[PDB]
Amino acid sequence: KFTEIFPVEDANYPYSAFIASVRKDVIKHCTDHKGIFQPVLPPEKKVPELWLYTELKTRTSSITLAIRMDNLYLVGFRTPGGVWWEFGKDGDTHLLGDNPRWLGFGGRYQDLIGNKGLETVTMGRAEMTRAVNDLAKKKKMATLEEEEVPEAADLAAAAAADPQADTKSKLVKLVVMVCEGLRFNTVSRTVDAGFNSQHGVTLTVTQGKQVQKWDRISKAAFEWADHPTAVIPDMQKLGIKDKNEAARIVALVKNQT
Numbered sequence: 001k002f003t004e005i006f007p008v009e010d011a012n013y014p015y016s017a018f019i020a021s022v023r024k025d026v027i028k029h030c031t032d033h034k035g036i037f038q039p040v041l042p043p044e045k046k047v048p049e050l051w052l053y054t055e056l057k058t059r060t061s062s063i064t065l066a067i068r069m070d071n072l073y074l075v076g077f078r079t080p081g082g083v084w085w086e087f088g089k090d091g092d093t094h095l096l097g098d099n100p101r102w103l104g105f106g107g108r109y110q111d112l113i114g115n116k117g118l119e120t121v122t123m124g125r126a127e128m129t130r131a132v133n134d135l136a137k138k139k140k141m142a143t144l145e146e147e148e149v150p151e152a153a154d155l156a157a158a159a160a161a162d163p164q165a166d167t168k169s170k171l172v173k174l175v176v177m178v179c180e181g182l183r184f185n186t187v188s189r190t191v192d193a194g195f196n197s198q199h200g201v202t203l204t205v206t207q208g209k210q211v212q213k214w215d216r217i218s219k220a221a222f223e224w225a226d227h228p229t230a231v232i233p234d235m236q237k238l239g240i241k242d243k244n245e246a247a248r249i250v251a252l253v254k255n256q257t
Contacts, residue, residue, distance in 0.1 A: 029042055029069055052068075083099075088103065118211055125195050131174055176203070219256060224242070
């Protein structure tokens with residue numbers, strides 16, 4: 001519904017700038033709840049009602065990300081050839097229009113990276129450049145070549161069971177840098193700090209666990225609006241005690257209403 005553009009490879013355009021710019025356009029569609037420091041996103045619906053489109057470009061290629069405004073999560077992406085790829089599998093219901101194709105897997109961190117924590121997702125500008133260039137070529141196929149050389153049965157079977165391992169990998173790097181970067185200022189701070197480092201940057205185990213509990217800390221955000229002194233198990237479980245620390249972690253909360 002509204003576009004953002006990020007020139008990945010442009011070293012002079014800081015990641016923090018893109019975040020600050022995109023959050024400002026998103027907050028335009030948010031509400032101010034008393035007792036809740038962070039802006040409250042639009043209420044969730046079965047059919048995403050406002051869409052954030054972020055176009056990530058390199059010097060070579062580019063892709064557009066289709067993000068729901070209500071929960072700030074990726075639904076699919078568009079290639080340069082105009083093919084939309086959506087999270088899901090045959091049998092599901094497409095949220096994207098324009099002849100979208102099913103990726104075959106879902107957007108859960110665990111459709112994506114199994115049971116390995118978010119701390120295993122290496123991020124950075126170079127990491128984002130390769131992900132876009134890679135996904136800009138998302139192919140429909142692997143007919144490819146066990147005729148090249150079973151008796152690599154080991155290779156042959158890995159390819160057969162996890163064909164889009166590469167895609168899942170590139171996708172979960174953008175999900176954390178963009179979606180999660182927008183939701184959590186703890187992630188945007190960490191991703192921006194090491195965005196141009198030569199060996200990439202990652203989020204700590206603890207950060208990953210909080211990131212995965214966005215809904216929960218969003219609920220607490222609302223609970224602390226009513227009772228700001230309340231202690232929250234699910235929160236202290238995560239290394240968060242009070243709305244004050246929570247304000248150093250989440251930037252935008254999920255609307256409970």
